[PDB]
Amino acid sequence: IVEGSDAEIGMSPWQVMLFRKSPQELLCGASLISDRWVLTAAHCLLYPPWDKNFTENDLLVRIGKHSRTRYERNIEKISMLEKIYIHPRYNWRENLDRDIALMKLKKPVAFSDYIHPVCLPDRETAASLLQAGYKGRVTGWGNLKETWTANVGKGQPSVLQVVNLPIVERPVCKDSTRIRITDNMFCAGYKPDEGKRGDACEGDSGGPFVMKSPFNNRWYQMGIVSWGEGCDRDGKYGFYTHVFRLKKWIQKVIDQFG
């Protein structure tokens, strides 16, 4: 996350860290949607161009974390995975269209003050909230800048980062890049003339873009950090997988595998 701030404890209890067993390393973000299901970006698990193709046994999910590196005993929970499900029409060859994946945990995690599921939006909530100008929130332990010099400062945060960003008009998203923007994506970020800055970055993928409903007070996950060109560049925007557009698939997987 670029130009964000340190998250407050318990501020994003649905935040999940995807972690590799060997070598031990942070892979991506993800979100808790129930006691046994986790949502993330498909490219986090499968991306041939980088020889990336993880199976259930290669990783762990760390739930309830604040610090990026410190093991937080009796706070965080480390769960193993029963199975991974990549969206069947995920397009890694072209533009990451349908960059979404589900992971079922081996055993249910107990919720706590630091561990709690986010809601997925229903059709009306999606129609009402996902509108240009309204702001959402993105969180992650990803890079603080698109490029940097480690000899003059660490590239990753010490603790979970957060930033609120406005949803952008679709034609504006399209006009900002040469990559094709599918109907299963949306973009967010400040325009050069708005003053404010902020963006997700490499390492933040799979993390959630959430919105708090003013009508029932609940937080809903509207997007999944997916891709961008550089980070926080002027005239460029972060792109997110449109969760509601692909909710039918999410529901299918879950009703089909409990």
Partner: peptide, 30 residues
């Protein structure tokens, strides 16, 4: 959404609000 999804234990459940959520709420008006 079902059950108590999206209601944070340390915030909405304790009727407390975080340091920047007002910004999100304000964007619905602005």
């Amino acid at each position: 959404g079902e059950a108590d999804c999206g209601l944070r234990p340390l915030f909405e459940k304790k009727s407390l609000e975080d340091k920047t959520e007002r910004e999100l709420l304000e964007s619905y008006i602005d």
